[PDB]
Amino acid sequence: MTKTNGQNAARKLVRLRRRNRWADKGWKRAHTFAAKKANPFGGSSHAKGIVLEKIGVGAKQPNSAIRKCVRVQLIKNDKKIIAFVPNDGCLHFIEENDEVLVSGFGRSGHAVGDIPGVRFKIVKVSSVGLYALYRQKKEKPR
Amino acid sequence: TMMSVLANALRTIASAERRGKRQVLIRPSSKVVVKFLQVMQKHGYIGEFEIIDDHRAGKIVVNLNGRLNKCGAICPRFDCATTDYEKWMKNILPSRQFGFVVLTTSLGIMDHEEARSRNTGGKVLGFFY
Amino acid sequence: VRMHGNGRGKASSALPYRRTPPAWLKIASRNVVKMVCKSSRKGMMPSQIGMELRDSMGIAQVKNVTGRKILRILKHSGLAPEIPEDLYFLVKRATQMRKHLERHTTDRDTKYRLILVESRIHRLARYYKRVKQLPPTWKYES
Amino acid sequence: GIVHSTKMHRTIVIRRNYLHFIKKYQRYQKRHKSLAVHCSPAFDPKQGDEVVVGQCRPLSKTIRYNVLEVVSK
RNA sequence: CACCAUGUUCAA
RNA sequence: UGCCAUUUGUACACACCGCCCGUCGUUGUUUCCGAUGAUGGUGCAAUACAGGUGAUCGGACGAAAGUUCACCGAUAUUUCUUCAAUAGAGGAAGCAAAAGUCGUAACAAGGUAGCUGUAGGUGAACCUGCAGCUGGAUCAUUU
RNA sequence: AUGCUGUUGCUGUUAAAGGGUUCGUAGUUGAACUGUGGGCUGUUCCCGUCCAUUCGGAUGACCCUGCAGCCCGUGAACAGAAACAACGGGAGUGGGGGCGUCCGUGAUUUUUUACUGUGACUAAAGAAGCGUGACUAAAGCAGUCAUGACUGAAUUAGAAAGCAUGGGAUAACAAAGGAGCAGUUUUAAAGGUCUAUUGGAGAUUAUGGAGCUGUGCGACAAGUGCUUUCCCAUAGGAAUGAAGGAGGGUAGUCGGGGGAGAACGUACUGGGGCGUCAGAGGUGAAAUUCUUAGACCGCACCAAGACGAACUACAGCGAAGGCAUUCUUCAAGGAUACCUUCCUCAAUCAAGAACCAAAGUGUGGAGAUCGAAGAUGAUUAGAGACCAUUGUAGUCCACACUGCAAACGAUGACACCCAUGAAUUGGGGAUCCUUACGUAUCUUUCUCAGCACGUUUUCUGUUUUCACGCGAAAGCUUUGAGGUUACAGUCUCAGGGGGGAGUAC
Numbered sequence A: 001m002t003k004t005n006g007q008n009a010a011r012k013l014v015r016l017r018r019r020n021r022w023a024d025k026g027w028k029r030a031h032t033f034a035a036k037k038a039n040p041f042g043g044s045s046h047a048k049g050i051v052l053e054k055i056g057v058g059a060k061q062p063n064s065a066i067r068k069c070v071r072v073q074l075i076k077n078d079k080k081i082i083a084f085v086p087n088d089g090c091l092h093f094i095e096e097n098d099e100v101l102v103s104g105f106g107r108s109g110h111a112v113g114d115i116p117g118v119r120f121k122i123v124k125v126s127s128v129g130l131y132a133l134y135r136q137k138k139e140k141p142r
Numbered sequence B: 001t002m003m004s005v006l007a008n009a010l011r012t013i014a015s016a017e018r019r020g021k022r023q024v025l026i027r028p029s030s031k032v033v034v035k036f037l038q039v040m041q042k043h044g045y046i047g048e049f050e051i052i053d054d055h056r057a058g059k060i061v062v063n064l065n066g067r068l069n070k071c072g073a074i075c076p077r078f079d080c081a082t083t084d085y086e087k088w089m090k091n092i093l094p095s096r097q098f099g100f101v102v103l104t105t106s107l108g109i110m111d112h113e114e115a116r117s118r119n120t121g122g123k124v125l126g127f128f129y
Numbered sequence C: 001v002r003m004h005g006n007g008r009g010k011a012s013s014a015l016p017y018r019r020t021p022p023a024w025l026k027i028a029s030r031n032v033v034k035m036v037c038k039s040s041r042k043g044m045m046p047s048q049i050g051m052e053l054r055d056s057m058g059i060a061q062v063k064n065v066t067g068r069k070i071l072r073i074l075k076h077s078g079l080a081p082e083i084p085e086d087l088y089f090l091v092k093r094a095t096q097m098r099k100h101l102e103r104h105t106t107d108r109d110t111k112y113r114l115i116l117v118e119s120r121i122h123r124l125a126r127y128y129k130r131v132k133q134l135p136p137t138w139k140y141e142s
Numbered sequence D: 001g002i003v004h005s006t007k008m009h010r011t012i013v014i015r016r017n018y019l020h021f022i023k024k025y026q027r028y029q030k031r032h033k034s035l036a037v038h039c040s041p042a043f044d045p046k047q048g049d050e051v052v053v054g055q056c057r058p059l060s061k062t063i064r065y066n067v068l069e070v071v072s073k
Numbered sequence E: 001c002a003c004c005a006u007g008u009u010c011a012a
Numbered sequence F: 001u002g003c004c005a006u007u008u009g010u011a012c013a014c015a016c017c018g019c020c021c022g023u024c025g026u027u028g029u030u031u032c033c034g035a036u037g038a039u040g041g042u043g044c045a046a047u048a049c050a051g052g053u054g055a056u057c058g059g060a061c062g063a064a065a066g067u068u069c070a071c072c073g074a075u076a077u078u079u080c081u082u083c084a085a086u087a088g089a090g091g092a093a094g095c096a097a098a099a100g101u102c103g104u105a106a107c108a109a110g111g112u113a114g115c116u117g118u119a120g121g122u123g124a125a126c127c128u129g130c131a132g133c134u135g136g137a138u139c140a141u142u143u
Numbered sequence G: 001a002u003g004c005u006g007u008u009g010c011u012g013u014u015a016a017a018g019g020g021u022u023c024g025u026a027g028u029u030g031a032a033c034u035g036u037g038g039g040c041u042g043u044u045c046c047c048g049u050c051c052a053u054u055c056g057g058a059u060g061a062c063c064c065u066g067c068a069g070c071c072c073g074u075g076a077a078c079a080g081a082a083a084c085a086a087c088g089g090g091a092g093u094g095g096g097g098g099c100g101u102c103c104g105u106g107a108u109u110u111u112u113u114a115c116u117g118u119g120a121c122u123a124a125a126g127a128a129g130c131g132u133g134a135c136u137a138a139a140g141c142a143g144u145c146a147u148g149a150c151u152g153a154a155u156u157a158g159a160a161a162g163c164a165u166g167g168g169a170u171a172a173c174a175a176a177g178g179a180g181c182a183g184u185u186u187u188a189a190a191g192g193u194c195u196a197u198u199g200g201a202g203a204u205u206a207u208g209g210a211g212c213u214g215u216g217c218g219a220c221a222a223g224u225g226c227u228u229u230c231c232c233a234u235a236g237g238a239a240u241g242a243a244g245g246a247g248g249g250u251a252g253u254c255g256g257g258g259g260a261g262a263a264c265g266u267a268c269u270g271g272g273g274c275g276u277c278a279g280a281g282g283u284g285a286a287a288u289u290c291u292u293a294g295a296c297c298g299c300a301c302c303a304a305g306a307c308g309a310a311c312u313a314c315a316g317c318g319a320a321g322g323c324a325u326u327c328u329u330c331a332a333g334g335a336u337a338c339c340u341u342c343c344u345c346a347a348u349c350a351a352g353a354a355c356c357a358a359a360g361u362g363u364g365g366a367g368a369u370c371g372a373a374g375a376u377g378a379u380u381a382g383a384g385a386c387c388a389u390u391g392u393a394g395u396c397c398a399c400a401c402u403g404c405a406a407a408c409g410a411u412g413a414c415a416c417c418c419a420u421g422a423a424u425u426g427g428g429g430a431u432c433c434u435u436a437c438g439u440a441u442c443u444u445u446c447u448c449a450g451c452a453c454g455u456u457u458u459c460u461g462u463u464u465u466c467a468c469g470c471g472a473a474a475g476c477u478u479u480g481a482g483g484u485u486a487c488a489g490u491c492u493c494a495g496g497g498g499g500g501a502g503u504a505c
């Protein structure tokens, strides 16, 4: 009950497939422009921003902590986002009005497990790497 | 309505052979469906068959001898070049040892093995093994 | 009637294999053409001529006695109907439904069956215009 | 081609109907090209007539071909 | 056939 | 009040001391509507019109300056169209967060069987009317 | 990786998903048939004549593709019929008749396309790889060897379309629709029409070649008998077939199918007419409510509006919604029967059409009963609910509108194959793989050569407990969810983790 044969039925099969590829959430995201115009990074990776304020986001059930994260405002398009600060400590390396280099983390913008509504991640603060500051490879300028 | 008479005939042979019958009654018949059966006689997959004359399209009574596993029809009759026989053998046949792909060529209705030897190509009709 | 409706009914006449007059009838092929052409001058259409010869004269299958068919005998003699017999009885049915529906304004079922006979009329008249049994301007009444 | 319309003065539009094979879906596809063809008064082709056209210079904005033989009906 | 509503968060 | 077996239903499984629905509060987020505000380009065609090209005259010293007309046309300004972005009092919807409030709608005949459509009512789950369905709690009882 | 985009190759009863039903265009798909030939030569039983009596006996079977020549259907010949498909300005200075080529030009009646086999053309770099110890390798095209030698840089795939050519299965385009139709030669005669030679060239000019038509005449055919056929005592017979595909017809029909008229049936209410007297109602208990100005009850009747109980069911009709008294009517519908007619007219469908339960809307009617809203009782912690009493819109009809269902079989349409045993509805028919065989019951002075039944066939419809097979299972199973990794009959619609959300624009 599914599809058509016929030696001259190729226009039917070409039209049939081009509409059913829009139902694929990978094909539709790769071929519509709401994907990049609403992505806070401009269809790119690692956008810079300025730290505005520090937030403690409480973990989801069944976990219980508060996740240390900053809210930053990106430079390329002035979009306010909340981004996580990975490691033990590490808001001690971030002050307000710091330029931070913010990547996503994990899952193509889908909020890695415990943290609710945070889908970006601090990589580098004041143009020195944030994991290099944790392991004390080098220290902050100024 | 009935569209392909050859696809009808091979489907009633294959159905009655998996039921282990001794005879089938094939209706309607054609010149094509008797030339398909005579390929299946020459490599001994069926026995003697008999065409009953109506002044309509005929009927065929085919004697089965237990050797046929599956006969089927490829619809639409795809065009097959001489370089394309090894592609059709891997797709519809169970092995390269046995099994035949029947083609309608300019030289006639033949299996794939004869058509490879006479260096011809055709449209594919069906298979039997 | 399979084309419109759900009927899978299989009731037909099954013509004999032995296409030969039965040798007990001594009527000439010449006289059967006179009887066929005479009945058309009494207003009988070709389907009604053949039953009267089948029932009373013993002529099953006028084609076997006289090598040509009844309507072919009529076309040679100039006695063919103006429009074909199939199209006659469908038009004559469709006008008897409409003369019903003018006084019976809410006969809901006969308005549905009238769509179906006119769909048969426009689908036969396309056949007869293509095969040139009917003029190109023909165009059913309603 | 086959004659499609003869409504213009001394010019016909021919229709070239061909099957376009798709390599992915192993199936053909009916396409067509229409060409305006200058038709000489040596010829009177009706619609549906099959003609043979030969390429020439531009004779108008769209006319590049010119009818050489008409095969009736 | 009167009425009969509810029991915090993880975990074992 | 409890216990044991069989049958049946279940969205229960640390198992009815279960599970679970909506309004309401608190926090955070992304949309939409909205008087009004406003931005960057297109297209449309309207005038004005820099320059030049061709022509016509011109003829200082053949041939410069300059006339005049036609054409190509930049730019300027306005008129709507159209695409992409954007501020907004107010009004909402949704989602997400450790244990706030109100009931208890659903799951068992969940204590009025559930549910579909529609219409009206209500803090809120929802109730009610009418015609359907069993995915029902009946495959069954003038032989 | 992902048969999680499925052409190969996915799902759609319940997991997301078949669209409410029909008609229907574009589209895609579409039944059979006109045929591939032949000859020669190779390559021991059992059936009977004597014994015995519900059981024995001595006494006609079977066994030994390969090469050549075909008027290559059969006619008809022993080149004629059948079937076939003129330029020297030419050719390396033109290779007395025949033969046969080459080149170019005229006159004569027509078959393509897809497919398929071979070719012809198609830049390197890149890919594939042939040589070679740049020390290996990634490379590169180089180098290798005993007053210079063999030099190498081979080859192949490269989308479609374009070009040439041969093969003719399958399909395709086109045309036809068959009364709409397409007699060959010998011979001499009549009339009449607009180039080559005579040395050239010019101008006149009759003859003649070959063709034009109206005849007579000599042969041979004819796919339809003219020694006929009609009158009376004038070409008309040559056409595949009739699809267990569609259409139409004719016939007794069959059904809660539809429309329209009348007429019935009890019942719920409401009335008066007759009587009664003390409560009825309602509930789990009550209370709102009715009642000595007479309720409830009982009897007959009347009015009005709905509705057709039991019979009424794994029954029928209809495309689906849906349809249940009767009688008179109108147009239909399917099935069945048929040696009627037709001859591919079909299948399925974007767009487009017409129907579509209930609620709802508009305008008129109607207004009995039930009754969203609302009002009173009660239950309750609360009760905006269930329960009781009411009661508006609605229910019902007419004409418009809407088009929102668990519109279900949670199952698209059309074909095909498919094991078994009870039944049921309508129609019809009988009473070494076998050359055939069985018939009862009871009603019967007029919709009566009747009705029902019994046994058996068979077609169409709605199903049931039962073989494969299938499925994750529940379950499905000629009524598929079977015939599916052994995956292609045709067309079509939808789905792609849960939501947001059937929301916003």
Ligand SMILES: *O[C@H]1[C@H](O)[C@@H](N)[C@@H](O[C@H]2[C@H](O[C@@H]3O[C@H](CO)[C@@H](O[C@H]4O[C@@H](CN)[C@@H](O)[C@H](O)[C@H]4N)[C@H]3O)[C@@H](O)[C@H](N)C[C@@H]2N)O[C@@H]1CO
Residues within 6 Å of the ligand: G423, G458, G459
């Ligand atoms: O059309 C039928 C078909 O041809 C045939 N195969 C048959 O199959 C059965 C048959 O089954 C039915 O049994 C029914 C009786 O209970 C009978 O129906 C018939 O009943 C008679 C009496 N009223 C007839 O008058 C009636 O017309 C008829 N319908 C059969 O149809 C069995 O009886 C046989 N024993 C076996 C057959 N295979 O069924 C088809 C229709 O169902």
Ligand SMILES: NC[C@@H]1O[C@H](O[C@H]2[C@@H](O)[C@H](O[C@@H]3[C@@H](O)[C@H](N)C[C@H](N)[C@H]3O[C@H]3O[C@H](CO)[C@@H](O)[C@H](O)[C@H]3N)O[C@@H]2CO)[C@H](N)[C@@H](O)[C@@H]1O
Residues within 6 Å of the ligand: A106, A107, A108
């Ligand atoms: N979810 C984030 C994932 O990260 C990936 O990002 C990168 C890495 O996480 C990942 O690195 C993997 C490493 O994790 C894993 N342990 C081994 C693997 N060999 C690495 O792969 C990488 O390193 C090798 C070198 O050997 C490179 O040759 C290779 O091209 C590169 N993919 O390879 C990716 C190339 O940088 C994918 N880019 C991204 O699509 C995916 O979603």
Ligand SMILES: NC[C@@H]1O[C@H](O[C@H]2[C@@H](O)[C@H](O[C@@H]3[C@@H](O)[C@H](N)C[C@H](N)[C@H]3O[C@H]3O[C@H](CO)[C@@H](O)[C@H](O)[C@H]3N)O[C@@H]2CO)[C@H](N)[C@@H](O)[C@@H]1O
Residues within 6 Å of the ligand: F027, F090
């Ligand atoms: N730009 C329009 C603005 O919308 C505002 O409206 C805000 C609210 O009315 C509205 O309420 C949202 C609501 O959508 C959603 N359903 C729930 C959410 N908690 C609310 O959010 C709002 O209220 C909470 C306080 O409890 C704040 O913490 C939160 O930041 C604020 N956005 O969301 C809007 C912002 O997201 C105000 N009316 C006003 O500032 C202005 O109209």
Ligand SMILES: NC[C@@H]1O[C@H](O[C@H]2[C@@H](O)[C@H](O[C@@H]3[C@@H](O)[C@H](N)C[C@H](N)[C@H]3O[C@H]3O[C@H](CO)[C@@H](O)[C@H](O)[C@H]3N)O[C@@H]2CO)[C@H](N)[C@@H](O)[C@@H]1O
Residues within 6 Å of the ligand: F026, F095, F096, F097
């Ligand atoms: N979040 C969107 C919607 O919120 C609604 O429900 C939301 C709230 O109404 C609901 O509130 C619950 C409530 O059920 C229950 N009675 C008490 C509970 N504390 C509340 O919880 C809420 O509030 C607390 C903070 O106060 C949060 O930590 C918690 O995550 C949040 N669930 O929690 C939900 C928030 O996730 C709809 N029920 C639901 O359909 C949907 O999830």
Ligand SMILES: [Mg+2]
Residues within 6 Å of the ligand: none
């Ligand atoms: Mg509570």
Ligand SMILES: [Mg+2]
Residues within 6 Å of the ligand: F016
């Ligand atoms: Mg509880």
Ligand SMILES: [Mg+2]
Residues within 6 Å of the ligand: none
């Ligand atoms: Mg010559």
Ligand SMILES: [Mg+2]
Residues within 6 Å of the ligand: G242
């Ligand atoms: Mg027929």
Ligand SMILES: [Mg+2]
Residues within 6 Å of the ligand: none
């Ligand atoms: Mg009364």
Ligand SMILES: [Mg+2]
Residues within 6 Å of the ligand: none
């Ligand atoms: Mg009374």
Ligand SMILES: [Mg+2]
Residues within 6 Å of the ligand: G379, G387
């Ligand atoms: Mg109560």
Ligand SMILES: [Mg+2]
Residues within 6 Å of the ligand: none
């Ligand atoms: Mg009431």
